């Protein structure tokens, strides 16, 4: 009767914004109700696979255990460097729009939408202009072999640290830098202790929303259409929020601190960085093999 929807984050976060806008559209255009579940509220991917949940929002990067190839988004420069062309990419990419749903299908999930949450931004105690600037810098990222490899290849020393300890580790010098979307940078106030921002353009934290396949396929052709329409709605709304949360975050960071610097890379500096990417692709294929090869190939085709 009621539809169960779980995501990875807390209220107000991007995935929750997408979720609520999805819930909104369904309830505004039907009698169905979407029961949302934020983090911890269920004790989740396996649940959706088993039909216990109907909808789930989980980032392909943290789905390595069920779908190794889903981690592909952690390869630096996998996708275009500018916000405009990445959006073009999510729209036209045969890899995103045709291959990926196949991968989730093999695990009993109807893939509804993949979307960028925002551009990765590096903060450090110095401005970063070349790979060499990463040398001897203990960088904290989200935990994944591909994220550590990106920075191992950049010259840096990957340094694990629970999220809630990241601020204090930047202050003490336990770490010298980290990467996060500008809005987590602003909101966490990381710029207060790590004032130099660099837009490297190498990563876009990509997430994904899907349904139980048996559930989705058991839906009337009208309900299937409703879900698709609701996902499209959640997508457009979410994209605009992201663009707008970005600039608002960049602005209020500058409103808060006079020590914050912003470094952006020209076409040629970025190129120096892309030369390091193959080391990460290899690590990706080492982890995923022939399926990874299949996926990675489409992604390279699509970027051309
Ligand atoms: Zn998020
Ligand atoms: Zn009713
Ligand atoms: Zn076009
Ligand atoms: Zn497969
Ligand atoms: Zn219905
Ligand atoms: Zn908004
Ligand atoms: Zn190897």
Curated annotation (Swiss-Prot):
Where is it localised? Periplasm
| Phenotype of null mutants | Deletion abolishes accumulation of ectoine from the medium.
- InterPro entries, A to Z: DctP_fam, TRAP_DctP_sf
* GO biological process entries: transmembrane transport
**Where on this chain does L-ectoine bind?**
9, 140, 180, 184, 205
Question: Which Pfam families does this UniProt record tie to the protein?
Answer: DctP (PF03480)
Q: Which UniProt keywords apply?
A: Periplasm, Signal, Transport
Which Cys-Cys disulfides exist here? none
- Keyword match Transcription regulation: no
Keyword Signal (UniProt): yes
Q: What is its main location?
A: periplasm
GO cellular component terms? periplasmic space
Give the function comment from the record. Part of the tripartite ATP-independent periplasmic (TRAP) transport system TeaABC involved in the uptake of ectoine and hydroxyectoine in response to osmotic upshock. Probably functions as a recovery system for synthesized ectoine that leaks out of the cell. Binds ectoine with high affinity. Affinity for hydroxyectoine is approximately 20-fold lower.
What does the subunit comment say? Monomer. The complex comprises the extracytoplasmic solute receptor protein TeaA, and the two transmembrane proteins TeaB and TeaC.
Q: Which family does it belong to?
A: Belongs to the bacterial solute-binding protein 7 family.
Other comments on record:
The ectoine/TeaA complex displays a closed conformation. Interaction with the transmembrane proteins induces opening of TeaA, which facilitates substrate release.
The UniProt entry, under NCBIfam families, shows: TRAP_S1
The record's listing under PANTHER family reads: C4-DICARBOXYLATE-BINDING PROTEIN DCTB, PTHR33376
- Protein name as annotated: Ectoine-binding periplasmic protein TeaA
Q: Which organism is it from?
A: Halomonas elongata (strain ATCC 33173 / DSM 2581 / NBRC 15536 / NCIMB 2198 / 1H9)
Q: Provide the organism lineage as a comma list.
A: Bacteria, Pseudomonadati, Pseudomonadota, Gammaproteobacteria, Oceanospirillales
**Gene that encodes the chain:** teaA
